[PDB]
């Protein structure tokens, strides 16, 4: 009956309301994906329950274990009926779960502490003084591990062997590392997140260079799910009506702090 929605605590997509302690169920959260979930549910005609993914990961398949973790895993193993979050549409994932057409378009980008002598990925690859890494168990790390183009291959070679680890468990951890490393750490993350943080106090980070690739986020459902068709149509309908653009302006710029 009630659709179990798996999501992730990633500002400004999903965040705890300041007074969540005195609220119940779905009312405890706020954000872009919370607003989107309510709309998808309205248009598809179903009641739902928002739940935060247990391991706090987006989703990747363990090499030897072969088990999927994160939100992808919750769907693969039947723990959730749908995932509404900044989950990237990728080949390896579409092989095991279904994705609606994208609700947000983005690409991998570079986040630096203001003043850092870095203007592009090629700049990062040709130097060694400034360390750089990505989020764990996600599409960004896989992008570099599989890239066959010179620059990115060079970047992966370095990142995979760097000590201490240059990878982080959460976006917040990567942003904090940039902010505290005095320009000696650069973070590779999706443009959407980079742009968001660039508008948050202390306004000490910035997105540099063009995006490394072009892709998008999609609402995911277990392969063969009966919700797939309607959800996809809802996303297209909502994008065409301007809701998605309205929602990004609401959570990114209307609330900018810089």
């Amino acid at each position: 009956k009630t659709v179990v929605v798996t999501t992730i605590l990633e500002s400004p997509y999903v965040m705890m309301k300041k007074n969540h302690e005195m609220l119940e169920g779905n009312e405890r959260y706020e954000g872009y994906c919370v607003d989107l979930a309510a709309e998808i549910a309205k248009h598809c005609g179903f009641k739902y329950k928002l739940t935060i993914v247990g391991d706090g990961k987006y989703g990747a398949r363990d090499a030897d274990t072969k088990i999927w973790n994160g939100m992808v895993g919750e769907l693969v193993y039947g723990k959730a009926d749908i995932a509404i979050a900044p989950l990237t549409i990728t080949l390896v994932r579409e092989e095991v779960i279904d994705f609606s057409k994208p609700f947000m378009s983005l690409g991998i980008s570079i986040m630096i502490k203001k003043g850092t002598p870095i203007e592009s990925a090629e700049d990062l690859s040709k130097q060694t003084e400034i360390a750089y890494g990505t989020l764990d168990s996600g599409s960004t790390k896989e992008f570099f591990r599989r890239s066959k183009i010179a620059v990115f291959d060079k970047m992966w070679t370095y990142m995979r062997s760097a000590e201490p680890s240059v990878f982080v468990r959460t976006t917040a951890e990567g942003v904090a590392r940039v902010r505290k490393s005095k320009g000696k750490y650069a973070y590779l993350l999706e443009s959407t997140m980079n742009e968001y943080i660039e508008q948050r106090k202390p306004c000490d980070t910035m997105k540099v260079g063009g995006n490394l690739d072009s892709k998008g986020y999609g609402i995911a459902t277990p392969k063969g799910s009966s919700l797939g068709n309607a959800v996809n149509l809802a996303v297209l309908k909502l994008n065409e009506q301007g809701l998605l653009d309205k929602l990004k302006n609401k959570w990114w710029y209307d609330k900018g702090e810089c």
Copy 2:
């Protein structure tokens, strides 16, 4: 058996080669979609025949008869097996045909002759000296027809009644009109085409303002096609391999003459 591919003559997606008269079959054409078709046929392992859509349209539904025209129509009525072209993913089309995840991201944009006093959609809707229109039988015209946002709504009110007609049968017709109108005509087209034309002689046009929306082009197949699933995965694979970006640079800027 050989897969019938429907496509449209639209530079730089599909164009007849300089020496096409001495060539046969698929060899007569070149372009982004020609390269994409070859890549997809190779990965999905099938033989194909490129055919140019009979009525030279992308695809819209006749409100009177409810009959689809253009490439969408050739798929809907079984005249073609797959469409590989700059065909926009939209709700009305998704209801009758299948689309792969996008192979290109874009948005509606404004094309002006260099020097015309226009920098945004809002600017066009506040004047009458400068006429403006869109392509017929496509997603762009539908966008304005179905827009409830103030500026675009006013723009449609003007366009749908304009006399002489401000709409055109082909992108080429719209571009030609902008160039010969001494700046009294602005053309609304997707950013992909706008950016392309901006890089071609006589280098007298330019894209102004940001995109009005965000969407993408998808490879289309008839509902319940056996090629659907595979093509979709092929597109994702190609994007992640960097091919799509490779092809974009090859046909847009490596050949740019401005």
